[PDB]
């Protein structure tokens, strides 16, 4: 059976790519992003437990077993997934297909199908074998929609522009044919007879056609530029609008550059969407008519031209793949030197302190030499390709003239038609050359469309959420966390079974160890994630029972790592909601202790916060976060690290402000230091993902439990 491998779209897709390769070898074809969600892939990497779990829930019967040189006994099933190390640099996943004569075929998502021998492979992979068997529930079928037509459908409301471009190109070719034939009329009638008047008339009448050709080229350029800009803008709008609706697990699982690169990928998709279609559509017919005209001129010369373009196509086809291989290798080796430079510059203080200058300058030189070697390999390939193409083109040009002169010597055609044939050779060779050179563009574009359109098939938050706006008015009452178990992925459960009760109008202080889960609990409180079992009860109604928009609007969370957006401070304090008076901003600043330093700024409230507000101090950023939090007058106020920085009286001001609400709104404070949380009605002390002590300060002090022990630790 045919061996199939799937190239990884990004870096950390080894497990998903291997699983997709197994599926497409056994028959199933699923979308790659869905498989990534199934496998629980994270930024650091993919655990084999997640891969096995995804295989089992997919329908495979999979097992992860150890192996030590036991790949010779017949007791095994193929293909099978293995883990390798790249000369002790970083882990990777490959899949072995068949071993025989101590020589093995393995698919590596990094490169493709790659040969290995027993000794080197055994010296590469340390240990581990994932065995997969098709189960009874395994159903073969295809689940991926062709996304190329999905992205090409944007051309449906733009038929007028492409029709005009096609007509202009047709007129361009028609006018160019006469310009090509001009030299034949010159050398056949206007020279052999000394008719100067006809020379003046014809030379002037065959020059305006070139001006019309230039005008057509101008019109084509304008139309193509407008079409390309429109398509790029539309694709970017769709992609960004869909990404902003994706759930939080998508953002947590991936990096930033992975999301950003799809913006540049829009141009690569558009190159096929706009350029390729028009190019092939006009060039096919123009090449056909040029070849027909050439056949009308002569047969042997047309055959010679066909032979030459055949050799050109063969050479391009045979040399195409090494070009991509070398380009990928250069892109891999020059992404390691740039990391060393940034790392060296960022840690220049330690480098100077320990005096590791010679080591650094020696290490960087080796990477630069490797980059230069890869670039020289690519240059070698390019020089070989260019030399062969030039040899073919020159030999064809010399052979054409020789054959034409020979035919004129016998006299199978007029002498002047050879020049016309040479002129038409450009019009015949350019379109077929473009068609031959279009293939790598098509391959890159289809890979790009598979990579980018993969995201658009994901499910947003609105679809997952049900409806609860029919009855809900606000988020007041008593909060129950009942049997809430949550996993931060496919790892050990960070949060355990809890019976948590937050009463009406009570200040709650959640305290625990640094490695314990406190911010995560607040995250589930606003429903950024979904618990696997258990429920969150508000007024006797579950999480499935509270409308999303209400949860977002009525809950204010101050993050541990505050983020200040670029722009005016006014836009920062009141974002999301508009039509708010300045009085609310003023009082938010007053109880946030922000009016004191904001007045010192050059502008009262129109000051522009550049570089994401890096000029302002951390305490000022905290004050801005607090002002934004109470600007929205939410039902649930969850503070995380507001008291991180204080001037020994600012915490007193903020505590007075929290005490000054005169409403039953609930405030939950995550606390690291214990002196801040005093005179608190309810305190929940958590160890090992479990709240142990539930009560006010006095009785739990009298209880003689871990709470007082932590005090014996902080004091």
């Amino acid at each position: 059976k045919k061996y199939v491998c799937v190239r990884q779209y990004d870096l950390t897709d080894c497990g998903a790519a291997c699983l997709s390769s197994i599926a497409q070898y056994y028959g199933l074809k699923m979308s790659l992003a869905k498989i990534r969600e199934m496998t629980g892939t994270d930024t650091q990497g993919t655990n084999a437990y997640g891969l096995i779990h995804a295989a089992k829930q997919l329908g495979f019967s999979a097992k992860g077993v150890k192996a030590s040189k036991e790949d010779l006994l017949k007791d095994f099933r193929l293909p099978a997934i293995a883990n390798v190390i790249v000369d002790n640099r970083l882990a990777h996943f490959v899949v072995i297909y068949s071993i025989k004569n101590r020589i093995i075929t393995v698919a590596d998502p990094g490169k493709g199908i790659v040969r290995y021998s027993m000794d080197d492979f055994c010296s590469i992979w340390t240990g581990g074998l994932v065995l997969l068997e098709p189960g009874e529930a395994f159903q073969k079928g295809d689940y991926t929609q062709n996304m190329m037509v999905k992205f090409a459908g944007f051309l449906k409301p733009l038929k007028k522009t492409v029709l005009c471009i096609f007509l202009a190109s047709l007129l361009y070719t028609a006018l160019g044919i006469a310009g090509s034939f001009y030299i034949k009329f010159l050398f056949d009638d206007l020279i052999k007879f000394e008719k100067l008047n006809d020379l003046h008339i014809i030379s002037a009448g065959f020059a305006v056609i070139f001006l019309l050709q230039i005008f057509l080229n101008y019109y084509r350029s304008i139309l193509v530029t407008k079409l390309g800009m429109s398509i790029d803008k539309s694709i970017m709008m769709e992609y960004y609008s869909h990404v902003l609706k994706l759930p939080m697990n998508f953002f947590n699982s991936r990096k930033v550059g992975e999301i950003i690169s799809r913006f540049m990928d829009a141009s690569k998709i558009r190159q096929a969407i706009s350029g390729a279609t028009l190019t092939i559509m006009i060039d096919t017919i123009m090449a056909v008519i040029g070849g027909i005209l050439l056949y009308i001129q002569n047969s042997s010369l047309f055959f010679i031209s066909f032979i030459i373009i055949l050799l050109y196509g063969i050479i391009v086809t045979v040399f195409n793949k090494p070009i991509q291989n070398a380009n990928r290798q250069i892109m891999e080796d020059n992404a390691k030197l740039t990391s060393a430079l940034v790392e060296s510059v960022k840690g220049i203080e330690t480098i100077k302190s320990f005096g590791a200058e010679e080591q650094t300058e020696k290490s960087t030189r080796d990477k630069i030499e490797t980059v230069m070697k890869s670039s020289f390999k690519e240059g070698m390939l390019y020089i070989n390709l260019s030399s062969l193409t030039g040899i073919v083109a020159g030999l064809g040009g010399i052979v054409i003239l020789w054959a034409g002169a020979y035919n004129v010597i016998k006299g199978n055609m007029s002498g002047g038609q050879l020049l016309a044939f040479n002129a038409l050779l450009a019009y015949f060779l350019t379109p077929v050359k473009n068609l031959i050179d279009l293939q790598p563009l098509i391959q890159t574009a289809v890979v790009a469309s598979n990579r980018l359109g993969e995201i658009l098939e994901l499910a947003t938050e609105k679809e997952l959420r049900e409806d609860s706006d029919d009855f809900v008015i606000s988020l007041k009452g008593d909060i129950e966390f009942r049997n809430v178990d949550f996993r931060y992925g496919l790892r050990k459960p960070v949060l355990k079974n809890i019976n948590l009760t937050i009463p009406k109008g009570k200040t709650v202080a959640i305290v625990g160890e640094s490695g314990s889960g406190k911010t995560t609990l607040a995250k589930l409180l606003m429903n950024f994630y979904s618990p696997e079992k258990g429920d969150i009860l508000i007024n006797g109604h579950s999480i499935k029972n509270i409308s999303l928009e209400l949860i977002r609007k009525k809950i204010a969370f101050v993050s541990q790592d505050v983020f200040i957006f670029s722009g005016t401070v006014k836009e920062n304090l009141c974002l999301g909601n508009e039509n708010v008076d300045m009085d609310e901003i003023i009082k938010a600043a007053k109880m946030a202790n922000a009016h004191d330093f904001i007045e010192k700024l050059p502008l009262k409230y129109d000051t522009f916060l550049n570089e994401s507000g890096a000029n302002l101090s951390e305490g000022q950023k905290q004050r801005l976060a607090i002002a934004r939090a109470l600007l929205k007058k939410p039902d649930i106020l969850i503070l995380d690290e507001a008291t991180s920085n204080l001037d020994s009286i600012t915490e007193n001001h903020i505590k007075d402000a929290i005490y000054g609400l005169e409403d039953d709104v609930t405030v939950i404070i995550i606390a690291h230091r214990l002196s801040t949380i005093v005179n608190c009605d309810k305190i929940y002390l958590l160890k090992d993902g479990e709240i142990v002590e539930s009560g006010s300060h006095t009785e739990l002090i009298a209880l003689k439990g871990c709470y007082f022990k932590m005090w014996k630790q902080t004091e």
């Binding site: 870096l11 990497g45 084999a48 097992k63 077993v65 882990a91 996943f93």
Partner: peptide
């Protein structure tokens, strides 16, 4: 099968990417 199956805790130790 081929060998003795590994435990889940040690199974988590296998990483990719």
């Amino acid at each position: 099968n081929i060998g003795r199956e590994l435990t889940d805790e040690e199974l988590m130790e296998m990483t990719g990417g």
